[PDB]
mmCIF file of C-alpha atoms and ligand atoms in Angstrom:
data_model
loop_
_atom_site.group_PDB
_atom_site.id
_atom_site.type_symbol
_atom_site.label_atom_id
_atom_site.label_comp_id
_atom_site.label_asym_id
_atom_site.label_seq_id
_atom_site.Cartn_x
_atom_site.Cartn_y
_atom_site.Cartn_z
ATOM 1 C CA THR H 1 124.697 116.324 74.313
ATOM 2 C CA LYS H 2 121.101 116.288 73.165
ATOM 3 C CA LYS H 3 119.194 112.928 73.145
ATOM 4 C CA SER H 4 115.462 112.385 72.370
ATOM 5 C CA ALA H 5 112.966 112.357 75.250
ATOM 6 C CA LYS H 6 111.272 109.427 73.383
ATOM 7 C CA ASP H 7 113.071 106.191 74.139
ATOM 8 C CA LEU H 8 115.236 107.644 76.925
ATOM 9 C CA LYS H 9 116.784 105.182 79.347
ATOM 10 C CA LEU H 10 116.572 106.117 83.041
ATOM 11 C CA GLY H 11 117.643 104.244 86.147
ATOM 12 C CA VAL H 12 115.843 104.815 89.368
ATOM 13 C CA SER H 13 117.472 103.713 92.728
ATOM 14 C CA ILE H 14 114.935 103.742 95.613
ATOM 15 C CA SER H 15 116.244 102.890 99.149
ATOM 16 C CA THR H 16 113.334 100.614 100.190
ATOM 17 C CA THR H 17 109.913 99.684 98.868
ATOM 18 C CA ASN H 18 108.616 98.384 102.261
ATOM 19 C CA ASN H 19 107.684 102.034 102.766
ATOM 20 C CA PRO H 20 104.390 103.190 101.281
ATOM 21 C CA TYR H 21 106.060 106.656 100.822
ATOM 22 C CA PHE H 22 108.647 105.171 98.499
ATOM 23 C CA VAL H 23 105.930 103.123 96.724
ATOM 24 C CA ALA H 24 103.997 106.254 96.133
ATOM 25 C CA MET H 25 107.244 107.640 94.600
ATOM 26 C CA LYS H 26 107.809 104.716 92.242
ATOM 27 C CA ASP H 27 104.182 104.749 91.095
ATOM 28 C CA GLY H 28 104.124 108.513 90.373
ATOM 29 C CA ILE H 29 107.530 108.072 88.614
ATOM 30 C CA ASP H 30 106.352 105.448 86.238
ATOM 31 C CA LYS H 31 103.184 107.341 85.495
ATOM 32 C CA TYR H 32 105.276 110.388 84.429
ATOM 33 C CA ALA H 33 107.764 108.215 82.534
ATOM 34 C CA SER H 34 105.094 106.524 80.314
ATOM 35 C CA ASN H 35 103.378 109.781 79.781
ATOM 36 C CA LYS H 36 106.460 111.485 78.142
ATOM 37 C CA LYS H 37 107.606 108.239 76.514
ATOM 38 C CA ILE H 38 110.652 107.428 78.791
ATOM 39 C CA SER H 39 111.924 103.849 79.298
ATOM 40 C CA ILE H 40 112.586 103.272 82.966
ATOM 41 C CA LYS H 41 114.031 100.592 85.266
ATOM 42 C CA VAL H 42 113.428 100.831 89.013
ATOM 43 C CA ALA H 43 115.756 99.036 91.482
ATOM 44 C CA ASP H 44 115.021 98.574 95.122
ATOM 45 C CA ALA H 45 118.024 98.564 97.619
ATOM 46 C CA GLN H 46 116.253 97.441 100.713
ATOM 47 C CA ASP H 47 117.871 100.115 102.846
ATOM 48 C CA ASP H 48 121.352 98.812 101.875
ATOM 49 C CA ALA H 49 124.228 101.120 101.065
ATOM 50 C CA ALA H 50 126.013 98.324 99.220
ATOM 51 C CA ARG H 51 123.129 96.986 97.134
ATOM 52 C CA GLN H 52 122.518 100.523 96.021
ATOM 53 C CA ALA H 53 126.186 100.869 95.008
ATOM 54 C CA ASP H 54 125.766 97.708 92.899
ATOM 55 C CA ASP H 55 122.372 98.964 91.548
ATOM 56 C CA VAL H 56 124.074 102.179 90.387
ATOM 57 C CA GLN H 57 126.812 100.315 88.384
ATOM 58 C CA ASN H 58 124.191 97.962 86.871
ATOM 59 C CA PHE H 59 122.533 101.120 85.425
ATOM 60 C CA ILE H 60 125.927 102.328 84.401
ATOM 61 C CA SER H 61 126.484 99.213 82.410
ATOM 62 C CA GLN H 62 122.930 99.266 81.191
ATOM 63 C CA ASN H 63 124.079 102.595 79.534
ATOM 64 C CA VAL H 64 121.215 104.653 80.934
ATOM 65 C CA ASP H 65 121.265 108.403 80.367
ATOM 66 C CA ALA H 66 120.520 109.521 83.934
ATOM 67 C CA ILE H 67 120.188 107.873 87.369
ATOM 68 C CA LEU H 68 117.580 109.108 89.684
ATOM 69 C CA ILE H 69 118.884 108.104 93.087
ATOM 70 C CA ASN H 70 117.242 108.126 96.487
ATOM 71 C CA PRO H 71 120.269 107.542 98.761
ATOM 72 C CA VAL H 72 120.055 105.301 101.902
ATOM 73 C CA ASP H 73 123.235 106.781 103.319
ATOM 74 C CA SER H 74 124.107 110.315 102.173
ATOM 75 C CA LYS H 75 127.844 109.698 102.906
ATOM 76 C CA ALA H 76 128.183 106.324 101.262
ATOM 77 C CA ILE H 77 126.379 107.180 97.931
ATOM 78 C CA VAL H 78 129.050 109.767 97.084
ATOM 79 C CA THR H 79 131.560 107.126 95.940
ATOM 80 C CA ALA H 80 128.937 105.572 93.548
ATOM 81 C CA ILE H 81 127.975 109.135 92.423
ATOM 82 C CA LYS H 82 131.530 109.877 91.381
ATOM 83 C CA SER H 83 131.306 106.561 89.541
ATOM 84 C CA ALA H 84 128.381 107.874 87.472
ATOM 85 C CA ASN H 85 130.098 111.195 87.278
ATOM 86 C CA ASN H 86 133.114 109.542 85.498
ATOM 87 C CA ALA H 87 130.791 107.653 83.216
ATOM 88 C CA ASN H 88 129.278 110.932 82.305
ATOM 89 C CA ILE H 89 125.750 109.953 83.477
ATOM 90 C CA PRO H 90 123.849 112.788 85.219
ATOM 91 C CA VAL H 91 122.796 112.115 88.748
ATOM 92 C CA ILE H 92 119.455 113.347 90.064
ATOM 93 C CA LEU H 93 118.791 113.075 93.796
ATOM 94 C CA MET H 94 115.350 112.537 95.237
ATOM 95 C CA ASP H 95 113.963 113.087 98.808
ATOM 96 C CA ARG H 96 117.416 112.767 100.468
ATOM 97 C CA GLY H 97 120.691 114.552 99.669
ATOM 98 C CA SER H 98 124.352 113.563 99.587
ATOM 99 C CA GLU H 99 127.485 114.896 101.249
ATOM 100 C CA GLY H 100 129.327 115.324 97.992
ATOM 101 C CA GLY H 101 129.631 114.471 94.319
ATOM 102 C CA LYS H 102 128.523 116.201 91.117
ATOM 103 C CA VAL H 103 124.663 116.183 91.160
ATOM 104 C CA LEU H 104 122.577 117.743 88.407
ATOM 105 C CA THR H 105 119.645 118.636 90.690
ATOM 106 C CA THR H 106 118.204 117.611 94.028
ATOM 107 C CA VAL H 107 114.339 117.323 94.568
ATOM 108 C CA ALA H 108 113.453 117.113 98.250
ATOM 109 C CA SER H 109 111.644 118.865 101.046
ATOM 110 C CA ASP H 110 112.939 121.271 103.742
ATOM 111 C CA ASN H 111 113.206 118.606 106.318
ATOM 112 C CA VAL H 112 114.431 121.125 108.880
ATOM 113 C CA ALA H 113 111.142 123.020 108.335
ATOM 114 C CA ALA H 114 109.268 119.675 108.708
ATOM 115 C CA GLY H 115 110.766 119.302 112.180
ATOM 116 C CA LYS H 116 109.835 122.890 112.756
ATOM 117 C CA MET H 117 106.031 122.399 112.152
ATOM 118 C CA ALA H 118 105.752 119.269 114.290
ATOM 119 C CA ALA H 119 107.066 121.006 117.439
ATOM 120 C CA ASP H 120 105.074 124.103 116.562
ATOM 121 C CA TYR H 121 101.963 121.868 116.440
ATOM 122 C CA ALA H 122 102.770 120.242 119.737
ATOM 123 C CA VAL H 123 103.399 123.496 121.533
ATOM 124 C CA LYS H 124 100.334 125.118 120.040
ATOM 125 C CA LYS H 125 98.131 122.220 120.864
ATOM 126 C CA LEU H 126 99.532 120.876 124.131
ATOM 127 C CA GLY H 127 101.070 124.093 125.571
ATOM 128 C CA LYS H 128 104.662 124.472 126.683
ATOM 129 C CA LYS H 129 106.772 122.118 128.777
ATOM 130 C CA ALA H 130 104.831 119.070 127.657
ATOM 131 C CA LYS H 131 106.498 115.713 127.930
ATOM 132 C CA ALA H 132 107.263 114.259 124.473
ATOM 133 C CA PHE H 133 109.168 111.374 122.678
ATOM 134 C CA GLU H 134 110.877 111.594 119.343
ATOM 135 C CA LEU H 135 111.080 108.628 116.876
ATOM 136 C CA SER H 136 114.203 109.233 114.728
ATOM 137 C CA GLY H 137 114.876 107.604 111.392
ATOM 138 C CA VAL H 138 117.889 106.111 109.534
ATOM 139 C CA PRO H 139 120.922 107.915 111.130
ATOM 140 C CA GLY H 140 122.787 108.206 107.815
ATOM 141 C CA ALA H 141 119.924 109.790 105.893
ATOM 142 C CA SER H 142 119.879 113.586 105.520
ATOM 143 C CA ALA H 143 116.115 113.604 106.224
ATOM 144 C CA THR H 144 116.700 112.517 109.765
ATOM 145 C CA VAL H 145 119.470 114.828 110.750
ATOM 146 C CA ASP H 146 117.418 117.729 109.367
ATOM 147 C CA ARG H 147 114.117 116.599 110.941
ATOM 148 C CA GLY H 148 115.816 116.238 114.241
ATOM 149 C CA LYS H 149 117.503 119.685 114.055
ATOM 150 C CA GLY H 150 114.367 121.482 112.964
ATOM 151 C CA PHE H 151 112.337 119.721 115.722
ATOM 152 C CA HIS H 152 114.694 120.462 118.531
ATOM 153 C CA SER H 153 115.009 124.062 117.509
ATOM 154 C CA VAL H 154 111.434 124.568 118.990
ATOM 155 C CA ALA H 155 112.053 121.714 121.450
ATOM 156 C CA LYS H 156 115.110 122.839 123.462
ATOM 157 C CA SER H 157 112.641 125.447 124.729
ATOM 158 C CA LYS H 158 108.766 125.038 124.851
ATOM 159 C CA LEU H 159 108.927 121.200 125.276
ATOM 160 C CA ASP H 160 110.386 118.590 127.738
ATOM 161 C CA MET H 161 112.094 115.603 126.090
ATOM 162 C CA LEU H 162 111.752 112.176 127.817
ATOM 163 C CA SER H 163 113.618 110.259 125.086
ATOM 164 C CA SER H 164 114.854 110.294 121.543
ATOM 165 C CA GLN H 165 115.561 106.723 120.102
ATOM 166 C CA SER H 166 115.535 105.731 116.435
ATOM 167 C CA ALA H 167 113.351 103.192 114.693
ATOM 168 C CA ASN H 168 114.831 103.407 111.216
ATOM 169 C CA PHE H 169 111.643 104.617 109.405
ATOM 170 C CA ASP H 170 110.059 101.221 110.208
ATOM 171 C CA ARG H 171 106.555 100.537 111.688
ATOM 172 C CA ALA H 172 107.583 97.387 113.586
ATOM 173 C CA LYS H 173 110.705 98.749 115.102
ATOM 174 C CA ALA H 174 108.762 101.892 116.144
ATOM 175 C CA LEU H 175 105.991 99.714 117.710
ATOM 176 C CA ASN H 176 108.566 97.917 119.939
ATOM 177 C CA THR H 177 110.482 101.111 120.604
ATOM 178 C CA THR H 178 107.431 103.079 121.562
ATOM 179 C CA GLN H 179 106.129 100.289 123.905
ATOM 180 C CA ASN H 180 109.343 100.213 125.828
ATOM 181 C CA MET H 181 109.446 103.988 125.902
ATOM 182 C CA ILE H 182 105.951 104.101 127.452
ATOM 183 C CA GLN H 183 106.950 101.583 130.219
ATOM 184 C CA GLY H 184 109.472 104.096 131.605
ATOM 185 C CA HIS H 185 107.475 107.285 130.955
ATOM 186 C CA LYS H 186 103.773 106.679 131.697
ATOM 187 C CA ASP H 187 103.219 110.460 131.645
ATOM 188 C CA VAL H 188 103.907 111.004 127.928
ATOM 189 C CA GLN H 189 101.669 113.402 126.162
ATOM 190 C CA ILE H 190 103.125 113.859 122.665
ATOM 191 C CA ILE H 191 105.023 111.518 120.301
ATOM 192 C CA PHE H 192 106.796 112.907 117.254
ATOM 193 C CA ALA H 193 107.751 110.460 114.597
ATOM 194 C CA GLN H 194 109.937 111.625 111.702
ATOM 195 C CA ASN H 195 107.924 109.413 109.336
ATOM 196 C CA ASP H 196 104.332 108.008 109.104
ATOM 197 C CA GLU H 197 105.473 104.368 109.349
ATOM 198 C CA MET H 198 106.687 105.108 112.878
ATOM 199 C CA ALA H 199 103.717 107.330 113.698
ATOM 200 C CA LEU H 200 101.421 104.427 112.788
ATOM 201 C CA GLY H 201 103.611 102.024 114.698
ATOM 202 C CA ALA H 202 103.466 104.216 117.815
ATOM 203 C CA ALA H 203 99.660 104.574 117.591
ATOM 204 C CA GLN H 204 99.310 100.742 117.937
ATOM 205 C CA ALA H 205 101.610 100.861 120.956
ATOM 206 C CA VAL H 206 99.777 103.772 122.572
ATOM 207 C CA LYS H 207 96.314 102.167 122.206
ATOM 208 C CA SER H 208 97.675 98.774 123.274
ATOM 209 C CA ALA H 209 98.846 100.334 126.604
ATOM 210 C CA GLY H 210 95.469 101.991 127.136
ATOM 211 C CA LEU H 211 96.740 105.645 126.901
ATOM 212 C CA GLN H 212 93.973 107.923 125.605
ATOM 213 C CA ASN H 213 95.500 111.533 125.442
ATOM 214 C CA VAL H 214 98.883 111.073 123.756
ATOM 215 C CA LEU H 215 98.958 113.351 120.776
ATOM 216 C CA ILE H 216 100.945 111.745 117.748
ATOM 217 C CA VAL H 217 102.526 113.754 114.926
ATOM 218 C CA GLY H 218 104.047 112.168 111.860
ATOM 219 C CA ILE H 219 105.631 113.161 108.552
ATOM 220 C CA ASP H 220 104.795 112.110 104.950
ATOM 221 C CA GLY H 221 100.998 112.483 104.488
ATOM 222 C CA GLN H 222 100.389 108.851 103.520
ATOM 223 C CA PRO H 223 96.799 107.658 102.745
ATOM 224 C CA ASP H 224 96.728 105.477 105.903
ATOM 225 C CA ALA H 225 97.853 108.431 107.997
ATOM 226 C CA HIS H 226 94.930 110.498 106.851
ATOM 227 C CA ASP H 227 92.738 107.489 108.089
ATOM 228 C CA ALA H 228 94.408 107.414 111.471
ATOM 229 C CA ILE H 229 93.627 111.096 112.006
ATOM 230 C CA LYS H 230 89.939 110.455 111.318
ATOM 231 C CA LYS H 231 90.080 107.324 113.495
ATOM 232 C CA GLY H 232 91.948 109.420 116.165
ATOM 233 C CA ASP H 233 94.851 107.095 116.246
ATOM 234 C CA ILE H 234 97.215 110.013 115.388
ATOM 235 C CA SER H 235 96.661 113.769 115.474
ATOM 236 C CA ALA H 236 98.515 115.371 112.483
ATOM 237 C CA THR H 237 100.959 114.581 109.769
ATOM 238 C CA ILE H 238 103.371 116.834 107.857
ATOM 239 C CA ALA H 239 102.494 116.048 104.268
ATOM 240 C CA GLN H 240 105.177 115.593 101.618
ATOM 241 C CA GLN H 241 104.870 115.200 97.779
ATOM 242 C CA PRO H 242 106.601 111.853 96.902
ATOM 243 C CA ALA H 243 105.132 111.638 93.429
ATOM 244 C CA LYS H 244 105.644 115.304 92.524
ATOM 245 C CA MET H 245 109.211 114.692 93.725
ATOM 246 C CA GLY H 246 110.086 111.966 91.239
ATOM 247 C CA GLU H 247 108.167 113.635 88.460
ATOM 248 C CA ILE H 248 110.132 116.865 88.569
ATOM 249 C CA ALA H 249 113.255 114.754 88.737
ATOM 250 C CA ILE H 250 112.344 113.001 85.532
ATOM 251 C CA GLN H 251 111.562 116.349 83.820
ATOM 252 C CA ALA H 252 114.976 117.588 84.953
ATOM 253 C CA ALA H 253 116.555 114.688 83.014
ATOM 254 C CA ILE H 254 114.454 115.515 79.990
ATOM 255 C CA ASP H 255 115.163 119.212 80.277
ATOM 256 C CA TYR H 256 118.966 118.572 80.683
ATOM 257 C CA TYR H 257 119.179 116.561 77.408
ATOM 258 C CA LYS H 258 116.941 119.329 75.764
ATOM 259 C CA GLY H 259 119.620 122.060 76.081
ATOM 260 C CA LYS H 260 117.662 123.737 78.889
ATOM 261 C CA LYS H 261 119.184 124.767 82.275
ATOM 262 C CA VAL H 262 117.844 122.857 85.271
ATOM 263 C CA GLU H 263 117.798 124.294 88.861
ATOM 264 C CA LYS H 264 120.511 122.931 91.147
ATOM 265 C CA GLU H 265 118.033 122.729 94.078
ATOM 266 C CA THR H 266 114.237 122.172 94.060
ATOM 267 C CA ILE H 267 112.474 122.416 97.444
ATOM 268 C CA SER H 268 109.281 120.328 97.588
ATOM 269 C CA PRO H 269 106.479 121.986 99.487
ATOM 270 C CA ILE H 270 105.237 120.537 102.746
ATOM 271 C CA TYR H 271 101.856 120.865 104.453
ATOM 272 C CA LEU H 272 100.378 120.339 107.879
ATOM 273 C CA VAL H 273 97.326 117.917 107.824
ATOM 274 C CA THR H 274 94.916 118.009 110.867
ATOM 275 C CA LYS H 275 91.481 116.624 111.427
ATOM 276 C CA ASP H 276 90.144 119.708 109.427
ATOM 277 C CA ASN H 277 92.553 119.167 106.554
ATOM 278 C CA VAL H 278 92.277 115.494 105.972
ATOM 279 C CA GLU H 279 90.552 115.985 102.671
ATOM 280 C CA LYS H 280 93.517 118.098 101.357
ATOM 281 C CA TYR H 281 97.055 117.613 100.171
ATOM 282 C CA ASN H 282 96.372 113.892 99.686
ATOM 283 C CA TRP H 283 98.761 112.044 97.407
HETATM 284 O O1 LIG V 301 111.117 111.517 103.100
HETATM 285 C C1 LIG V 301 111.207 110.095 103.391
HETATM 286 C C2 LIG V 301 110.018 109.543 104.028
HETATM 287 O O2 LIG V 301 109.752 110.344 105.292
HETATM 288 C C3 LIG V 301 110.034 108.136 104.430
HETATM 289 O O3 LIG V 301 109.104 107.801 105.304
HETATM 290 C C4 LIG V 301 111.403 107.664 105.012
HETATM 291 O O4 LIG V 301 112.513 108.260 104.259
HETATM 292 C C5 LIG V 301 112.436 109.713 104.185
HETATM 293 O O5 LIG V 301 113.528 110.249 103.550
#
């Protein structure tokens, strides 16, 4: 099976586009696509596991040559993956994994390591036994179970947890969640958000309650998050590479149809971004 990279039809299923991170992914994907002459159709799922399933079959009937999927639920996507497996359409996973199904390659970070660096930053900045919140994400996404595991590794010891509720990777839900979390625990010192949308939402809740020394740590490295660090609204973020993610996914589809072997796993590098680092690792 060797098709031409020129005029290659690819489907791209992104969970939601309300998130700047997954917008940066789309934009970097289309830039790579047009640079190597790949025809591409992106389909937003709006954090729906069923709209994604229908978005997969629409690509399947579009007769695309590969489907770049960013799952919303890592368990529910498996059924649709076997559907593309039967149609002999290679599946490439991005940012989040899946619990089963035949996948050509997976491009994503070490989300366990991402949780690692956030607790390490808190313990290194605010000492040990410091009172902290966690803002978890979509419970069915592999990125939130891994970020929570890697965080609590260095958080069972060295840190005191007041709460751990989820805001589903959403600014607004995190704003409300944080505000209520503060009401109970006025003595909070650190807030860990598994994504920058929640970090930015916690920052508004912290400053609306008049708290002045609550260190905030996020994950993604989004342009606005660099700006909050300079403005002092948050303290650090764990940078990801959303564009470089979807661009080594596209090249994997090209390399597959080129008769070249592609790695089953590709770990995207992550980086800490503090007030001294704000100029680096930007998307
Ligand atoms: O890695 C991505 C980003 O952190 C985004 O903010 C939410 O979904 C995660 O999987």
